[PDB]
Each structure stands twice: as C-alpha cells, then as structure tokens.
C-alpha cells in the first residue's frame with residue numbers, strides 16, 4: 001500500500017508515512033499575485049542549457065522523468081534568488097484528467113492544465129542525494145502549461161510516451177534540448193518549499209515562471225494515455241498526478257518583476 005494519487009493513497013494520506021507533509025514549508029502553494037512582493041534585489045534567472053545531455057526517459061508509476069547526465073558542469077541554473085550553482089538532473093510534469101486542472105502551483109487560485117518541473121541540485125553538496133538533506137539543496141524551475149498552440153520543442157517527448165506506457169518502462173532519450181520547453185520571459189515568483197511528492201523534503205527553492213507555455217490538446221491527450229499501473233495490471237490512466245496547494249504558513253512569495 002505505497003503512496004500515489006488515489007482516494008486511498010493520495011495526498012491526504014501521505015502524512016501517515018511522511019509526517020513532514022504537515023510541515024512549515026510544504027509545496028505547492030497558491031501564488032496570490034497581489035500579496036507577492038516585487039523584490040528589486042532579485043537577479044535575472046540564468047538558465048544555461050546549451051550543453052544539457054539527456055540520457056533516458058522513465059515511467060516510475062507517478063509521472064515520466066527525462067533524465068540528464070549530471071556528471072559534468074553543463075546544464076546549470078544560477079542567479080535569480082540562488083546563491084551558487086545548481087545542476088539539472090531531470091524534468092517531469094504534473095497534469096490533469098481535464099484541461100481545467102493539473103498544475104500544482106496555482107495563480108490567484110487558477111489551475112493550469114499541467115506544470116513542468118526542471119529539478120536542479122546545489123553543486124556545493126556534491127550529489128543529488130546529499131543535496132536533498134539541505135534546506136538550500138534543490139532549485140526547481142516550474143513552468144505552467146496551457147492548452148492552445150502546440151509546443152514544437154515538446155513533440156519529441158510526446159512521441160516517445162507510447163514506448164513507456166506502464167510503470168517500470170524506460171527508453172533511451174538522448175540529445176533532447178530542454179531550451180525548447182521555455183517561455184519567452186524568465187519573470188518569476190520564488191519562495192522556500194518542498195518536494196511535492198514523498199519524501200516531501202523541505203529542501204527546495206521554488207522558481208515559478210509567470211509566463212505559461214502553450215501545448216496542443218493533442219500533446220496533453222498523449223500524457224493522459226500513460227498508465228500508473230505496470231504492464232499486465234488493471235489499467236489506471238496516469239492523470240491528476242498533482243498535489244493540491246498547501247498552507248503558506250510563515251512564508252513570503254517574492255516577484256522578480258513589477
């Protein structure tokens with residue numbers, strides 16, 4: 001009886017195995033745009049993905065992960081609210097059963113169709129596993145998806161999903177350029193938070209871009225054909241793999257923009 005997104009194992013159950021679920025810096029949150037304070041001390045975000053080297057795409061029974069070779073200093077996130085340099089290890093999405101839900105963060109209670117997370121670890125802690133034990137261990141870049149025009153840079157991901165339908169399936173996925181998933185503007189909100197799945201560790205500086213990307217209805221419909229279940233198990237469509245907004249408690253959301 002492992003955690004998931006269902007009635008009996010979903011977000012309202014996670015606190016039993018992971019008591020930090022009710023902690024002081026949980027993610028995601030609602031971004032109240034009128035309360036978020038413009039912080040002139042925040043720097044432009046530096047996203048350097050020119051040398052990013054993807055290895056594999058994996059269905060882990062929760063989402064699909066596009067994984068990167070993080071063995072050299074290549075694909076790095078720095079500046080913005082960050083001190084030092086954070087290395088890209090993987091990206092994944094959260095999405096809904098319908099276009100009206102799927103994002104984890106919300107903006108004035110607006111839910112987007114999906115949300116992309118690019119996960120980076122602080123190079124001062126040497127590897128990903130050590131970084132998540134630190135309050136400044138990870139920087140996750142969050143990007144909202146709305147349904148409209150296709151995102152050409154997403155199509156290579158969409159076209160490989162047929163090969164990883166079920167939990168435990170993986171495929172070679174080299175030479176994927178994550179620059180093709182970025183909106184025009186790097187205007188962002190930032191706040192201290194957590195992983196949004198177990199183990200829910202309070203190790204993340206969240207950087208949520210204001211500008212969504214557009215994807216087509218056809219692109220998101222292919223996300224919704226994935227399965228939570230393993231090959232030769234009862235079909236459970238991989239949909240609504242999002243955690244709802246958690247209490248903000250004693251935190252401030254800062255805006256990079258006026």
Ligand SMILES: C[C@]12CC[C@H]3[C@@H](CC=C4C[C@@H](OS(N)(=O)=O)CC[C@@]43C)[C@@H]1CC[C@@H]2C=O
Nearest residue numbers: 117119128129132140194195196197198199
């Ligand atoms: C691999 C680990 C468990 C899985 C952890 C990872 C740290 C960050 C995320 C990101 C998160 O999703 S999200 N939404 O918070 O970005 C989904 C869980 C995941 C992959 C841990 C690092 C060490 C630990 C075990 O070795």
Ligand SMILES: [Zn+2]
Nearest residue numbers: 092094117196
């Ligand atoms: Zn995520």
